[PDB]
Design a protein around this nucleic acid. Structure first.
Lengths: 51, 271, 55, 100, 88, 117
RNA sequence: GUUUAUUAAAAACACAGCACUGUGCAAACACGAAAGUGGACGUAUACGGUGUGACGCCUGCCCGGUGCCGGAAGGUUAAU
RNA sequence: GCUUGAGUCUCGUAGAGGGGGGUAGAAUUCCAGGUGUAGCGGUGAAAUGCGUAGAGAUCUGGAGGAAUACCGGUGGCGAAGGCGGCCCCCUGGACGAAGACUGACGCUCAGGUGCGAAAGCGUGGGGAGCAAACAGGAUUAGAUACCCUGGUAGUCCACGCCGUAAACGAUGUCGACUUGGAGGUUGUGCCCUUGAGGCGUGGCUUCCGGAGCUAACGCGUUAAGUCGACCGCCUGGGGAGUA
């Protein structure tokens, strides 16, 4: 979660949060408890991941 | 165990009893009994001061130990008994030095059960000890309000008081009312909750049951003439007035606490 | 993997913010990913590892 | 008589009462003719997260074979004792003796 | 299920010898032992509806074997249910 | 006044508004500025521009403290946050740490239903 | 069940049950120039007041008026 | 009588199978307090709502309830409904390896009995979040809706009831035979284990396809192919799964 750097620093370059929290994990927990749509969203996500 | 009576003869149709097989079927312990003469609701002037009281069954008073002074001596619960003067049951207990006393019976307490009053008592239900030694957030009954005086809070059946704070020489207590009250922390209190909760589930069923607990009828105010009650009179049913006591003071809302002496000790009124 | 007290091994199999890493990344055949995760959780109870990096 | 692995943290300020406790606990095991296989005192070790804040605490690993009743009263001993925070007793996984 | 020492004891009591562990009296007695032990378990719990399904498999299977042994040798049947205290 | 010389910039980016609070290392706030309090009410208070002018305006109003070092703590998602920390090192601050402190439940409370728009 | 002893026994009163409200104990409340007493040797699962009146299905909308509860900013406001 | 069906015993394996008890960490809400100050929240835009009685933000302490991120996977277990932190206790089943034992003890099953999501009902608790009803704000021609702000039953626990679902692989159960390929998961045997290998042999499962079947679509060794046993059900649409 943290970053620090010594005096050679210019830019933020914190892409630790395109790794874990920001993009998916908080936008997922904005909306409803189903049990049902996730079983089919994961079903078609794993059925789309195919060659 | 609550039991609906079978509806033979109306009068029994709606009765719910609270039977207890663990109460002592027999005579109470005699040298802790004394005469309790019934008053009728009437003061030393003869006048009815509290209305609706009178008749009912003959009762003998049972000296219940609310103080719990025998500190450090253990006591085994000899039995549980029916007390007519209270909602709760009383446990007759036997100290190790051969002294019997009646205490209010807490919730889990059966016959053959060790209780122990005093500072170094174990924290388990039935043990009376000062509230600077009880943990915060514990259900506690038979609470003293002044140290040494006797228990006066949470005595009626199924009733507890939660200790919520220990700020200094005082403990903040959530009374069963919902009221937050400060009590001095040297005041003893008995652990657990007092134990006949199902008392509130009984339904009495007929008019004579109320009569035999000593509760005379209540004539309602609007059925009277104007000379009797402020509600009075009127050619069929006629209310038209703001509801009052029989002495003209507003019922239905009007707050009647005036103390100013114990307002220091009230952290929050009930709601 | 079988053990949870070896927190060097467990600390390899965890991310920088306390989260268990998927077997899609680290190899780790599924039996040992299950033993692994269950050992990580037993270690987080004992405060050998952290639950997160914002305690 | 089955196997158990007991660990428990101790409050750091009562660290000097640690080996005494150990003895008593081990004594309780020998009250039931159960045997104790390893025993480790891991020292005051830094906690990964604060608990009542209280950082660095004193860990004791035990690994005892015993009947389940003395393990149960050992658990209640860990309940009431204010010294010990976070016990954990586990599975058989038949008797171990090694380090980590 | 049942202890190894318990199963060995029942095989030793009901079989022709040890290693005769599939005979009809032996299977019936092992099922009986487990049925009674789980009477103790299901007096408590009472909402372990999954374990009970295993128990009713034990009851039904015991019943099938008693029916077999009844229509093969009735003397073994009467000695068996006499010894196990079943049939009520 | 009181001359703290190190603080923390808690930026609270949400979808509708970013709110920047500059405090000390004890956690006592020294001065705040929201994107909605900088003009541009409405669809324009959730933009990176509004967040950066919110952060410029929060860099002002803590001149009374002489803050030179600060950590950055970032909550929530939002069109803000990234631009926000940029505005902070466009205001002479030595930006030391950038932590992201978004609250993530470990499957806690049930989130609300919504949005059949 | 009770009631107009002596023209009214009833659909009226009562009632169990329900609800609202007051009451933290030196309780509210009542009798009492006061002391005191009843409430109660009870303690909110208790006690007082008010309405409705077993049980079953239910109890809709209105807070502008009158009351009550709460608020404290401003206006007005006694003795001094 | 016999062992190739069915079952018992020995040793292990994997598992969110069940029931009871305890505990842990994040987060939401509430309460008390510190800093601090003019907005916060919300939306397509707004307003209702909260806020100088000091909100929102932020830090500290506390209470409480529910759910258990990451692992997590057309992964696993269960007859089905379903089951997801960690630990203990009680307990069911499955599968594998070699050997021993019983000896057809088997398959299906009308009536019968049991289990059976969710909502709902009864009694007693609990009540943080979410949220039918409800209220207000908008939107609109209207808006008893979608959207916003609140919000009660309910959701949670104990015991009892109900007895249903697109309770669905829209595919009854049991058994036998019939070309293949790529995986997943869990056992086991053999070989320089010369490593994250090579060769087999089981259990469960996913995708694609051959013959065959099928109205077609598709199914395709887990069949909707080729057969056998027993059960359940169908007979034009509506009326009506109603009286």
């Amino acid at each position: 979660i943290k970053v620090r750097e010594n005096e050679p620093f210019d830019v933020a370059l914190r892409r630790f949060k395109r790794s874990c929290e920001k993009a998916g994990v908080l936008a997922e927990v904005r909306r409803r408890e189903f049990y049902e749509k996730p079983t089919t969203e994961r079903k078609r996500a794993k059925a789309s991941a195919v060659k | 165990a609550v039991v609906k009576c079978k509806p033979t003869s109306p009068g029994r149709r709606h009765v719910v009893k609270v039977v207890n097989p663990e109460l002592h079927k027999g005579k109470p312990f005699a040298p802790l009994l004394e005469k309790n003469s019934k008053s009728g609701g009437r003061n030393n002037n003869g006048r009815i001061t509290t209305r609706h009281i009178g008749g009912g069954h003959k009762q003998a008073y049972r000296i219940v130990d609310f103080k719990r002074n025998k500190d450090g001596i253990p006591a085994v619960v000899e039995r549980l008994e029916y007390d007519p003067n209270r909602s709760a049951n009383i446990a007759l207990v036997l100290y190790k030095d051969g002294e019997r006393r009646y205490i209010l019976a807490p919730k889990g307490l059966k016959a053959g059960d060790q209780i122990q009053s005093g500072v170094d008592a174990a924290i388990k239900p039935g043990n009376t000890l000062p509230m600077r030694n009880i943990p915060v957030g514990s259900t506690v009954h038979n609470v003293e309000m002044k140290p040494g005086k006797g228990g006066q809070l949470a005595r009626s059946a199924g009733t507890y008081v939660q200790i919520v704070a220990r700020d200094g020489a005082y403990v903040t207590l959530r009374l069963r009312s919902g009221e937050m009250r400060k009590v001095e922390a040297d005041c003893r209190a008995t652990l657990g909750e007092v134990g006949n909760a199902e008392h509130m589930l009984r339904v009495l069923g007929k008019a004579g049951a109320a009569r035999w607990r000593g509760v005379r009828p209540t004539v309602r105010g609007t059925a009277m003439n104007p000379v009797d009650h402020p509600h009075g009179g009127g050619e069929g049913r006629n209310f038209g007035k703001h509801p009052v006591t029989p002495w003209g003071v507003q019922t239905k809302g009007k707050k009647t606490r005036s103390n100013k002496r114990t307002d220091k000790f009230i952290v929050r009124r009930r709601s | 993997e079988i053990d949870y007290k070896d927190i060097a091994t467990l600390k390899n199999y965890i991310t920088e913010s306390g989260k268990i890493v998927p077997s899609r990344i680290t190899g780790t055949r599924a039996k040992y990913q299950r033993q692994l995760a269950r050992a990580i959780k037993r270690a987080r109870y004992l405060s050998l590892l952290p639950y997160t990096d914002r305690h | 008589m089955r196997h158990y692995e007991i660990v428990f943290m101790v409050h750091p300020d009562q660290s000097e009462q640690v080996p005494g406790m150990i003895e008593r606990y081990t004594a309780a095991i020998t009250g039931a003719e159960g045997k104790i296989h390893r025993l480790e005192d891991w020292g005051r070790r830094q906690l990964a997260y604060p608990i009542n804040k209280l950082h660095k605490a004193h860990y004791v690993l035990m690994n005892v074979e015993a009947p389940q009743e003395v393990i149960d009263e050992l658990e209640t001993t860990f309940r009431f004792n204010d010294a010990v925070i976070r016990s954990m007793v586990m599975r058989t996984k038949h008797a171990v003796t090694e380090a980590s | 299920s049942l202890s190894t020492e318990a199963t060995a004891k029942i095989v030793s009591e009901f079989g022709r010898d040890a290693n005769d562990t599939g005979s009809t009296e032996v299977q019936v007695a092992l099922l009986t032992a487990q049925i009674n032990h789980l009477q103790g378990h299901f007096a408590e719990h009472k909402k372990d509806h999954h374990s009970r399904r295993g128990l009713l498999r034990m009851v039904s299977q015991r019943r099938k074997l008693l029916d077999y042994l009844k229509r093969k040798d009735v003397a073994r049947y009467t000695q068996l249910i006499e010894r196990l205290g079943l049939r009520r | 006044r009181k001359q703290v010389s190190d603080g923390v910039a808690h930026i609270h980016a949400s979808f509708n508004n970013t709110i920047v609070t500059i405090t000390d290392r004890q956690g006592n706030a020294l001065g705040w500025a929201t994107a909605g309090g900088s003009g541009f009410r409405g669809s324009r208070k959730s933009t990176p521009f509004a967040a950066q002018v919110a952060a410029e305006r929060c860099a002002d109003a803590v001149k009374e403290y002489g803050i030179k070092n600060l950590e950055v703590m970032v909550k929530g998602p939002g069109p803000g946050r990234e631009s926000t920390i940029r505005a902070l090192n466009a205001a002479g601050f030595r930006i030391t740490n950038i932590t992201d402190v978004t609250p993530i439940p470990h499957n806690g409370c049930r989130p609300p239903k919504k949005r059949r728009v």
